[PDB]
Amino acid sequence: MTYKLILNGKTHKGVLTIEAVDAATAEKHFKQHANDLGVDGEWTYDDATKTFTVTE
Ligand SMILES: [Mg+2]
Ligand SMILES: [Mg+2]
């Protein structure tokens, strides 16, 4: 199962995908990868397109 993340951070941008089992596990990892970068932002998840956004 492919989940995508949009990062629109103030210094870091991009699009990352991750192969996961539920969106629970994608969330965990992408949210940890956010912290690691120093991204604190507003999060969204659209289930139909499997896409997390996080915007600083
Ligand atoms: Mg880690
Ligand atoms: Mg670190």
Swiss-Prot record:
<protein>
    <recommendedName>
        <fullName>Immunoglobulin G-binding protein G</fullName>
    </recommendedName>
</protein>
<feature type="repeat" description="2-1">
    <location>
        <begin position="2"/>
        <end position="56"/>
    </location>
</feature>
